[PDB]
Amino acid sequence: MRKIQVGVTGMTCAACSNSVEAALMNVNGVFKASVALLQNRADVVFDPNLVKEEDIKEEIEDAGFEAEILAEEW
Ligand SMILES: [Li+]
Ligand SMILES: [Zn+2]
């Protein structure tokens, strides 16, 4: 696995953050998704054999938000 810190804009309630988490957990290859409503962040642990950063970004976009990778954690 690798871990990325994704920036997300548009989340303004608990349901929003939950929706982003749910969306991410439905992406094949994503092991863990932790969303921080207050910080415009979604931290994602994923298997690069099965999914990449762009796909993670796209899943968040498809959910209804805007996203870009902020940093690689490990
Ligand atoms: Li925010
Ligand atoms: Zn909301």
Neighbours of ion ligand 2 (CB under 5 A): 12-13, 15-16
Domain count, the chain: 1
Q: Which amino acid is at 34?
A: S
What is the arrangement of strands in the sheet containing 41-46, beginning at the earlier edge strand?
30-36, 41-46, 2-9, 66-72
CA distances (Å), origin 38, targets 12, 17, 45, 74: 8, 9, 20, 22
DSSP readout, 35-58? Answer: EEGGGTEEEEEE-TTT--HHHHHH
Dist. CA 1–CA 52, nearest whole Å = 11
CA of 49 to the centre of ligand 1 (A): 31
What is the residue range of 32's domain?
1-74
| CATH number of the CATH domain containing 46 | 3.30.70.100
Is 13 marked as binding a ligand? Answer: yes
